[PDB]
Design a binder for this molecule. Structure first.
Ligand SMILES: CCC[C@H]1Cc2c(C)c3c(n2-c2cc(Cl)c(C(N)=O)cc2O1)CC(C)(C)CC3=O
Length: 208
């Protein structure tokens, strides 16, 4: 079964701003997704200290960047804490609402789109380069889910029947036709070096 949900008004407004505002510095989407992966990895690592059984779903703490020119996708994989069904549907959208209001107020005041991460809504910067975003996630206390949205005010959540992940999150970016530069090895390496050189987890850039 595929469940369809409406984004809260502020999130739909945020997504429309990201998709419609003329802003050439699109490359910042990668640092935002890597930062979310790094934060998710910090969470599981901290949780594992009081409960070692939380790493029974995988001991390796890493980030993989997987470009696919045939499917026109850039996948960001992490072995972080993952997200529950409640996180995908309600929890994160609720925390994102306040961050969204503050960000849109800052943009009106003179701030730029690159500052999105300071408002904890950096995940939505994925819509700078992607026409559709698929999020495959597995949290220790829940099942594997697939979240998906092409914006337009709605998202879907379904139980994932694909390849089991153990634990973590896969962000599949279905790139816009004119954003294929983010599938190029040299381009991804340049972006990682410029904005994510001090991330405390190994970042492996897969090759085609
Ligand atoms: C609590 C701060 C971190 C948030 C930030 C965040 C927000 C805010 C939202 C999402 N994320 C988010 C994304 C990813 Cl891909 C990861 C990860 N790699 O584990 C962790 C995330 O949680 C994804 C969403 C639930 C589909 C929509 C949303 O509003």
């Amino acid at each position: 079964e595929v469940e369809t949900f409406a984004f809260q008004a502020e999130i739909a407004q945020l997504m429309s701003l990201i998709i419609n505002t003329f802003y050439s510095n699109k490359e910042i989407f990668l640092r935002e997704l890597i930062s979310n992966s790094s934060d998710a990895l910090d969470k599981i690592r901290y949780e594992s200290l009081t409960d070692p059984s939380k790493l029974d779903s995988g001991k390796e703490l890493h980030i993989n960047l997987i470009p696919n020119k045939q499917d026109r996708t850039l996948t960001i994989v992490d072995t972080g804490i993952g997200m529950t069904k409640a996180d995908l549907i309600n929890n994160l959208g609720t925390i994102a609402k306040s961050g969204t209001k503050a960000f849109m107020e800052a943009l009106q005041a003179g701030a730029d789109i690159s500052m999105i991460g300071q408002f904890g809504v950096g995940f939505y910067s994925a819509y700078l380069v992607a026409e559709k975003v698929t999020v495959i996630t597995k949290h220790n206390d829940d099942e594997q889910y697939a979240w998906e949205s092409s914006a337009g005010g709605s998202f879907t959540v379904r139980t994932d029947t694909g390849e089991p992940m153990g634990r973590g999150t896969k962000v599949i970016l279905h790139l816009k036709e004119d954003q294929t530069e983010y599938l190029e090895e040299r381009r991804i390496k340049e972006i990682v070096k410029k904005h994510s050189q001090f991330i405390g987890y190994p970042i492996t850039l897969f090759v085609e």
